[PDB]
Structure 1
Amino acid sequence: SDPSSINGGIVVAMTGKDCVAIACDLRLGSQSLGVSNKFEKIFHYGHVFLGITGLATDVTTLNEMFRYKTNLYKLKEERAIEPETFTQLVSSSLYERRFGPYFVGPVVAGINSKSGKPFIAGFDLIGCIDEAKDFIVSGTASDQLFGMCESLYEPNLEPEDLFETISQALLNAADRDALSGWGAVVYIIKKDEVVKRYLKMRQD
């Protein structure tokens, strides 16, 4: 019934010292039935990262849509799109379907190639933007994530520390959600490099 609880899954993003981190679980289920343990919910266009929780078909569609738009953006602007700009694009693209929305919970993370300033943002299914300074949670275990983040989080963590923090937030939240888990992947992002690590977790 609820399009946002059919497939399950979660995403979380955090800001650190000259870095940002975005993580997600890997489950794609069909209600109680687990279907895939390799459904990644994080994508990137240039140096901008986008996580999308919700109805899987929409997650896929929105990714294909943004690849399309950022591609033409680069061709015209002759430069890769920035987090702040992309966030606006995500918002207007979602509101454009105001009365027949995609059932997703988008999350944007990245660092502005010109100011180096870390950036993260969350949106509701119809485009409303939430630009947090600390963290953004999304998915079927968002209550759990809020709980984890509100406690585990502290400002200006170093890349190696933020990784521990965000992973523990994702991991323990997903273990309290029947529709999340089956793998997880964390992205640590810095001005010059991005490292992607797969975590080890329960498979039930």
Structure 2
Amino acid sequence: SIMSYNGGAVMAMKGKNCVAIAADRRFGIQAQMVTTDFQKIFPMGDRLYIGLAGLATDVQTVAQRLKFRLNLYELKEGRQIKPYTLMSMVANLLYEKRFGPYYTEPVIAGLDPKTFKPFICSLDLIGCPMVTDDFVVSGTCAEQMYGMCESLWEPNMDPDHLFETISQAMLNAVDRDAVSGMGVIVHIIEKDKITTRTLKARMD
């Protein structure tokens, strides 16, 4: 499309009391790589990360115009946001631009502040919600990562096994795509802590 113009990958993955969301880092104008570090993962409160891949402009508008709705909701109401609502809230924001859409596809990783239930989901560029329990992917290498995760996953993993899986699942799916790669970062969220490791990928 024109969501290929910049490239990008994101990927969420449920554990059993943890959730891990991983992304590539590479802001490139067609084939030419400009910068090697360009964040596609944003904090949305604690234990809630939205991952936006696709057109690098809307990646930045939609994380700014989504922070503006979120903050104006954690103040007006004292509660802190639920992961199921941050899905419905970012659905409505895309569908607001129905004709002449944004060109991002959100991925939401996160835990329920009041328990620690894990929760992931992706969306279409027009704002359709898709809750899964395996893993959700979006990007230009989507089909690369679907195949790679369908046979590299397990129904329950601990925080050390998850980070093993998604790591070796991102590295191999993003290396088979031209316009992605050059540095993977992985958040992995427990109830306790938020560990964030960068993987050593092929800089070509």
Other-structure match for 1:190: 190
Report the TM-score, using the length of structure 1 for normalisation.
Answer: 0.97
How many residues are matched?
A: 203
Letter in 2 for 1:152: L
Pairs within 5 Å for 1:54-203 = 54-203=54-203
Q: Secondary structure at the match of 1:108?
A: strand
Letter in 1 for 2:52: I
Letter in 2 for 1:43: F
Letter in 2 for 1:128: C
The structural deviation recorded for 1:141 is: 0.6
Q: Secondary structure at the match of 2:109?
A: strand
The structural deviation recorded for 1:24 is: 0.1
What is the CA deviation profile of residues 122-177 of structure 1, one whole-angstrom value per residue up to 9, with x for unaligned ones?
00001101100110001011110001110111111111110010011111011000
Letter in 1 for 2:158: E
Report the TM-score, using the length of structure 2 for normalisation.
Answer: 0.97
Q: How far apart, CA to CA, are the structure 2 residues paired with 1:191 and 1:82?
A: 15
Other-structure match for 1:7: 6
Q: How far apart, CA to CA, are the structure 2 residues paired with 1:9 and 1:117?
A: 28
Letter in 2 for 1:22: I
Q: Secondary structure at the match of 1:79?
A: coil
The structural deviation recorded for 1:82 is: 1.4
Q: How far apart, CA to CA, are the structure 1 residues paired with 2:78 and 2:193?
A: 22
* C-alpha RMSD over aligned residues: 0.8
Letter in 1 for 2:65: M
Q: Is the 8 A contact 1:141 1:173 kept in 2?
A: yes
Other-structure match for 2:22: 23
The structural deviation recorded for 1:116 is: 1.4
What is the CA deviation profile of residues 35-56 of structure 1, one whole-angstrom value per residue up to 9, with x for unaligned ones?
1110121001112110000000
The structural deviation recorded for 1:192 is: 2.4
Letter in 2 for 1:71: N
Letter in 2 for 1:136: V
Letter in 2 for 1:83: P
Q: Secondary structure at the match of 1:4?
A: coil
Q: How far apart, CA to CA, are the structure 1 residues paired with 2:193 and 2:85?
A: 21
Letter in 2 for 1:199: L
Point out 4+ residue stretches in structure 1 off by more than 3 angstroms: none
